[PDB]
Paper text:
The structures of [name]–miniGs and [name]–miniGi1 provide molecular details of an aGPCR in the recognition of different G protein classes. Similar to what has been observed for the class B1 glucagon receptor GCGR26, Gαs and Gαi share a common binding cavity on the intracellular surface of [name]. In association with a longer αG–α4 loop in Gαs, which causes a steric hindrance, the receptor ICL3 adopts an upward compact structure in the [name]–miniGs complex but exhibits an extended conformation in the miniGi1-bound structure, which results in different patterns of receptor–Gα interaction in this region. To provide further insights into the autoproteolysis in modulating receptor activation, we also determined the miniGi1-bound structure of [name] with the proteolysis-deficient mutations H565A and T567A introduced in the GPS motif. No electron density was observed for the GAIN domain in the cryo-EM maps of all the [name]–G protein structures, suggesting dissociation and/or high dynamics of this region. Alternatively, the cryo-EM maps of all three G protein-bound [name] structures display strong densities for a lipid molecule bound to the intracellular region of the receptor. Using [name] as a control, we discovered that two lysophosphatidylcholine (LPC) molecules—LPC 16:0 and LPC 16:1—bound specifically to [name], and that other classes of phospholipids did not. It stretches from the membrane lipid bilayer to the intracellular tip of helix II, with its fatty acyl chain penetrating into a ‘tunnel’ shaped by ICL2 and helices III and IV, forming extensive hydrophobic contacts with the receptor. The LPC molecule serves as an anchor of the receptor intracellular region, stabilizing the conformations of ICL2 and the intracellular ends of helices II and III, which are functionally important and have extensive interactions with the G protein. Therefore, it is likely that this lipid-binding site is unique to [name] and potentially ADGRF4.
Author numbering:
A (entry chain R): 567 to 852
B (entry chain A): 10 to 53, 182 to 230, 241 to 354
C (entry chain B): 2 to 340
D (entry chain C): 7 to 62
The structure:
Amino acid sequence: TSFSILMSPFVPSTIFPVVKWITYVGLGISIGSLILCLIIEALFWKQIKKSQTSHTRRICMVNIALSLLIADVWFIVGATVDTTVNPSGVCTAAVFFTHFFYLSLFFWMLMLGILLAYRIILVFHHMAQHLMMAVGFCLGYGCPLIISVITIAVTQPSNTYKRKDVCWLNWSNGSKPLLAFVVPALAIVAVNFVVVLLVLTKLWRPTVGERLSRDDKATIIRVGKSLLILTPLLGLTWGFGIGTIVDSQNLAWHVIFALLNAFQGFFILCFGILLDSKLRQLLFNK
Amino acid sequence: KAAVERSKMIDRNLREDGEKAAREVKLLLLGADNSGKSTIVKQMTGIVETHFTFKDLHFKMFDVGGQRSERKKWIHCFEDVAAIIFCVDLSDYNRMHESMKLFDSICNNKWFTDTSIILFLNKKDLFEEKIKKSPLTICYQEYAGSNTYEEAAAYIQCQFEDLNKRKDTKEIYTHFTCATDTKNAQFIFDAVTDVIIKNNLKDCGLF
Amino acid sequence: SELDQLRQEAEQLKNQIRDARKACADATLSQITNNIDPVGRIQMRTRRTLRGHLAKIYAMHWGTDSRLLVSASQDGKLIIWDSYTTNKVHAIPLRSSWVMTCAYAPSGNYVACGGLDNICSIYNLKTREGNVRVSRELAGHTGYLSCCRFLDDNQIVTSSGDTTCALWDIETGQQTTTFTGHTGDVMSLSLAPDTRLFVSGACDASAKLWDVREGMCRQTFTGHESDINAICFFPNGNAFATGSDDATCRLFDLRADQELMTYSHDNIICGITSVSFSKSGRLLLAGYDDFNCNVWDALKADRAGVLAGHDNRVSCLGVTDDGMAVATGSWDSFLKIWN
Amino acid sequence: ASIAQARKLVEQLKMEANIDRIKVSKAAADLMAYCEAHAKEDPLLTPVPASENPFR
Ligand SMILES: [C][C][C][C][C][C][C][C][C][C][C][C][C][C][C]C(=O)O[C][C]([O])[C]OP([O])(=O)O[C][C]N([C])([C])[C]
Ligand SMILES: CC(C)CCC[C@@H](C)[C@H]1CC[C@H]2[C@@H]3CC=C4C[C@@H](O)CC[C@]4(C)[C@H]3CC[C@]12C
């Protein structure tokens, strides 16, 4: 709807009509971007990736893409239906699935961030690929399922999973089901923040030995490219959600949050996929 | 069937050997005759492999140069190397020409398009006396830089660095002779871990 | 002065040889084979995919019974495969991680390996103790061991990187015979079916046919223009195909002392790693650096089929003794049994 | 030192000079006869049925 109801108690009525069209067009472009990304991933499956590094990274990206697409279509379905046509018919399952898929996407971004941190801080350490895949799948899907089922089993008897017109998770002096979306999802992003900084700490390391200077500030382009590639994949743009927690009265935070996260799939395609030269060479001629 | 059990046992042994070899660095050393490679390799036929462990990390160093055959016919099997160790005899001006030729040929091969270089500058102690005895400007027609030893070493580094055309994909390093063997091992380990970090980042698409 | 006369004599001898060759070349094989029907497209399916190697498989050989297989890779070990059931029989931990050639005995007893160590290690598969052990370590080569083959269980022929072939006696351990005369590094060799004479290709675009009993260069062919990496006799033993770095598989004839055809195409620009012949010799096989093999008609110079499916450059391919299937080992540590 | 090598090369060339060569047509006919003699015994050329194919 406004797309700010994800992490805000309410959205101002003066900004909702303006931001609604932007949200709808952003989610449509995101659906298109995820469709294109899945098509190119299916076309290039098991061919570009050679080492376990590329395999794990590509599995993480494809899981994130699938979760984003399913969550976005579920959110569209939940928004397009009325709150009184099916109070428990269609929006209850829709909001359950949408929250579960958002949190699974957040935990998959956590998986990618912790994978990068582990692979950077510990240079020479080999781990079983199948065991790593199993652990990632178990904790990136089992934990969201557990939190979703406990949320749907605790607040259901009180009929406080949804409040009035909004059949998203409720707040503002009721139960506390929205803490399953505000506390973890932000915190994951917080982790994805420091890991990013960690990458920066390893992208500006002093030159080993006393070798003479190589580039006259030519690494700025590489650092910027890495930052723009890694920002949408790690979901840093969700940080502005805490801004909605801080005030929930000013429209600038909501507008920028909706604009950045609505086009999150477009950013993922442009930076995560399009900026990769290994795919640029194979896509220019095809 | 006993054949299935034999196959399973052999597969287990192969997987154990692969796990053991995954922790290996598999470095590679080059240079010229009497260019100081002995000092760099002995700090602790065809080609010889020297194995040394530092900070719980094992390195194999292959002294390529004793084959005395066509390099293009067996260099393709020297892939998957973390970096290329290179040694240059600074004192000997005559050795410099073919050292530079070998460095240019090796860095320009299609196979070594991503592997880094940890080239060393050996015989640095005796090079200071050589400059005082024989001016550097006489030895080389091109400019020799300032009369100081440090600027001469900087000029040597500069003319070594620009020979590598693949500046972006190759991150070379420069070091001089250290009396203590600990310093050379520390520098080699730091270069190897930095190269592995860069390779992991490149494989992760960050670069 | 004195050397000038020798140069002139050599030049006039070469002119006489080439004039005789041109005179004998009445008509090429391609014109004669216009009446023959084309083989047509051939379907090639990987019945088995032998996996377990951890590094690029660089050399391999087929067993004498067309069942057992042997493969060598820069990992540092030799693997014996049961091609029928994909099972592994033996895994020798070679003392040298760099192995460049492997050979299987005509009786399935000894296996030979070689590489940049310049020595040939012969291992006994059948031992009283049970554990595989190094039967022999032949040494005396100053270059890398590019190729090696067994004449029998007691005699071996090897090609080194110092322009020298050597017929070694396994029991003696010394060079029984030495063949020299190549101006470039000898990369591969193949044995005739009667094991009485063998042809070896060098890096000077010259394939030399030597006689093992005599020890002298019986014949020399110069038709290529780059390195020669593949050698394989015809099943009849009168012809042999040479693969070079120009994607031109050239078919030479021992009796004719000519070049019959040069299988090549405009699409292929890479080189050749290994070639092989079918049981009847009509269906030629070759391995290219463009990540896939190529099956040609040995009498029509037409690409009969493509064996794509390898993720890296193909290294060594070989046809069984009975011609039941063809094995193909590539640089992605993968062996495929095409049929 | 190269004089001995040149003499050895010219002696080898002279030894290879007096080697008889048959017509190319005769060798082509022999290859034709060999190819059609064992054509039925070429499992690669003629697809063997899976009943007796060990790799099928
Ligand atoms: C797709 C599927 C998948 C997805 C993605 C991938 C990732 C997963 C996970 C990773 C890994 C995790 C595990 C744990 C760790 C270990 O192991 O070890 C420890 C030490 O101890 C370490 O230590 P520290 O100090 O803590 O370091 C750091 C690490 N981290 C992880 C925390 C970062
Ligand atoms: C990494 C860079 C590029 C983007 C960072 C985006 C997020 C993580 C940032 C942008 C603006 C930030 C907010 C700016 C101001 C405040 C008010 C105060 O209570 C401190 C926290 C809080 C609420 C910040 C939380 C983190 C925040 C939402």
